[PDB]
């Protein structure tokens, strides 16, 4: 079976830069190679078909070249809404094989996160479990350290965090860190807070609350 | 982009020689076919190989062709004296997609027939009748040299002469050796002012010198 | 008189696979040892018969079908096979009694700018019966609305063109295929 | 109106069976090349099966003998019968009209097939009440403890789209998924505008509307 | 027999025109395409132009683009090459050669080669008009077998016929191929080897004949004193 290799695996570039990804075929596949753009959550969208032909309605900034075993997929000037994972596929020879995919991120200016902290709802506390949520909204780059502090004690192992995909408008990420405690262990402490350290911050920012108040 | 052939290949009878033919991305590298032509001296070319490797009916099996990537080769196994000719490779050019063909510079195959032969040189001073016409021409006549490859240079009281020199290409004569002639056009004032004039002919790591006086 | 097998394998031009050419061979003798002895054929698979043991067999009629396909599609010229060629161009029955001969012809049927005169049928509602030659140029109605001979969306020309360039891989190079069908007996050895 | 609508995905125990139906509009399925393509969570795309216009079926090595593809001309629907399901079959299953020529390539939206032995549980929705920095405020909903994937969350019955961030679900140590969806609104509209998050969990047939309001003694 | 016979070649002043005709026989001329190939003296082959089976399209090398025009008359089995505004670098032997069969040949017509060549018609370009040669005697030296000859300097065009003693002397005669001086005129030397004894008891006359200028010169070669 054919095996498509796709470089690079990930990619970050500024708006307007030329973006070029490659897709080398294991065997000769002529020019029967397509390129797909899959935005987060949505289905793949065909952009280039037969190595170099642009599908009707794709902007001009998308290009394609190559034949035999080495192919290229070029973005003229990168735009914010172009963020997605890009795959290459061969379809002439069965089975149909895809590439590993290329994740593309925008290189925008530095943006500091807006921090919010949420106590566990009194409704959830009736279930015997408490969940404290820490929010980092619209920041860049994605590198962000969230540190939970419970009565000034550094917590670890009891929290899970989740990061969105780059917003197709402002190219910023958002992070959610969820701390999970029992109702008992939640009521053993008074001060709950998360400490956010980020490039866009001159010093770590902390949002806190007191249990009960 | 054209084709590149060796200027001359050589081989003894019974040996095997190869003539290369390198191209570019627009001809042999583009996957075109390569044809080979043999041209005896004074005759029209003959198709030796067509379609990289195929022989036309009537071509001896001694000849064979091949092609790889951006180059083609002609293989003449068991050299015969009759194989001494000029060989041209021909392909097609796809700079702009139309219909253009490209030949090579040609390769002069010389079968090592007889042994080497030192040339005999006969230098003639300008005739008295030519000096009356306000002209002067030294005639350096070369003969009986094999192989046909000589270098002729003139001197003027030992100092070299770099102008007014014309030289023939060696021509095969009857006894299959070569002969060539060189002429040094001069001014009657230039001829009588110097004390000697010499034509030095070099052949296979050896040089013969003949000199004439203006008496 | 001898059988005119030379007119088929040696033809300066070959027909497309959808309009595959057939030669009816009758009233002649032929030695099939000459054909197998040649190792120029990349593929030479006989079904229900022995290659060497064919000079001692008499047949009523011998059909010679010749066309051109890709190297990847030569495997479809065989009984019980599926694919764009076996389903929509040339289908061999399951009880096939004959031989399948093919050889690479990238040197003949492949222009540097691309040879596009060799075609194949890309669209068909159902598969071909064995030895069926469909040569229809009717527009293929893939949608709910009819075409009325107006090539367009959901209305495509049923044939597709091979892109035979000499820079192609072996699987994409043109292969000249000859399929012998062994059916008063008039063809012996 | 060219589009592929597909359904039939859900939870199923390993070794079980599940059929996925893909209804078509705008073209004839029995006349086109159709294909199923699955995408594992976080992984790339993987071709599954093909049916030709003439009816020839082709399958990948990893589902050969277990999966079957068919179609119904009267309903214009593409099917994918799945048998002897394994844990590695968990993925989103897009049905697509295979590209053959210019502009006929159309993909479905896929369904979530989750091959697992655990039971189905509807999520619990808890409010994330806003705090107190002057200008802008934040609020959201916690979608905790559900299985399997996925859930859909909107706000004010789709009347709110700007400034909304719904985070990818996390897999807790309990084996159930937890998720949170937030939105940034101006601090002035807190006392006059009502905010309700609309969560939908198809495998449990759970549809919840939770009002999110400020906290006060 | 398959045969290509071209003609119409000669000498012409620069900037003027010439037409070459190539007769074909022994093959269906209508189907094959035809080439024109020239070869300068001593140098290699250089493709000029090509024309289809019907003449619909034509291709030329950049050296002759706009100046040359190729055509064919299928009813006459003849190939043409209209040469206009000729230059000095156009001086060569012009062959017509059979191309590929686009009608009923192979699909890859590049597989064919120039399988049938013509005999080669000759063209020459110069502004120096006809001129007879000046015959100068290369006198034999006087030292201790000797050699004498004649210098046939400055003539145009080729050729000249040199003989000795009205043709009675064929022993040791050696006529060399002429040079083409940078002036456009030809120079030639013809010598004969003789015994040192017969220098004073035998006359030696070289007979140079040049038909284009209608001149015949007989020069006496005698030792110096
Ligand atoms: C195809 O045609 C060629 C001629 O171009 C045939 O080649 C002959 O082959 C026999 C032996 O098989 C030789 O004795 C002849 O000398 C060959 N002739 C030439 C002109 O080369 C070839 O046999 C033909 N093949 C078939 C299958 O008919």
Residue numbers in the entry:
A (entry chain L): 1 to 213
B (entry chain B): 2 to 216
C (entry chain E): 334 to 516, 521 to 526
D (entry chain H): 1 to 131, 135 to 220
E (entry chain A): 1 to 144, 149 to 229
Quote the study on this structure.
The trimeric spike glycoprotein on the viral surface is the prime antibody target since the spike plays an essential role in allowing the virus to attach to and infect host cells 8,9. The SARS-CoV-2 spike glycoprotein is composed of domains S1 and S2. The S1 domain contains the receptor-binding domain (RBD) that specifically binds to the cell receptor human angiotensin-converting enzyme 2 (ACE2) and some RBD-bound antibodies block the interaction between the RBD and ACE2 receptor, which lead to the neutralization of SARS-CoV-2 infection. In conclusion, we report fully human neutralizing antibodies that target non-overlapping epitopes on the RBD of SARS-CoV-2, functioning with mechanisms that involve inhibition of receptor attachment and the fusion process.
To elucidate the binding modes, detailed interactions with the spike and mechanism of neutralization, we determined a cryo-EM structure of FI-3A Fab with spike, and higher resolution crystal structures of three Fab complexes. These high-resolution structures were (i) FI-3A with RBD, (ii) FD-5D with RBD and (iii) a ternary complex of both FI-3A and FD-11A bound to RBD. The ability to generate the ternary complex is in line with previous findings that these two target non-overlapping epitopes on the viral RBD 14. Like FD-5D, FD-11A binds to the RBD right hip/shoulder 11, 14 but more on the side making a smaller footprint (680 Å2, 540 Å2 by heavy chain and 140 Å2 by light chain). Only two CDRs, H3 and L1, are involved in the interactions with the RBD, of which Y33 of L1 makes tight hydrophobic contacts with V445 of the RBD. The 20 residue H3 loop engages with the α6-β5 and α1-β1 loops of the RBD (the loops that make extensive contacts with FD-5D H1). There are six tyrosine residues in the H3 loop, five of which are directly involved in the binding (Y109 is not shown for clarity). RBD residues R346, N448 and N450 which make extensive interactions with FD-5D are also heavily involved in contacts with FD-11A. REGN10987 approaches the epitope in a similar direction to FD-11A but shifts about 8 Å to the back of the RBD such that none of the light chain residues are in contact with the RBD. FD-11A binds to the spike of B.1.351 lineage in a similar fashion and effectively neutralizes the variant 26. This is exactly in line with the structural analysis which reveals that FD-11A does not have any direct contact to the mutation sites of B.1.1.7 and B.1.351 variants, as is seen for REGN10987, which has also been shown to be resilient to these variants 11, 18, 24. The structural results showing simultaneous binding of FD-11A and FI-3A to the RBD were confirmed in the context of the cell-surface expressed full spike.
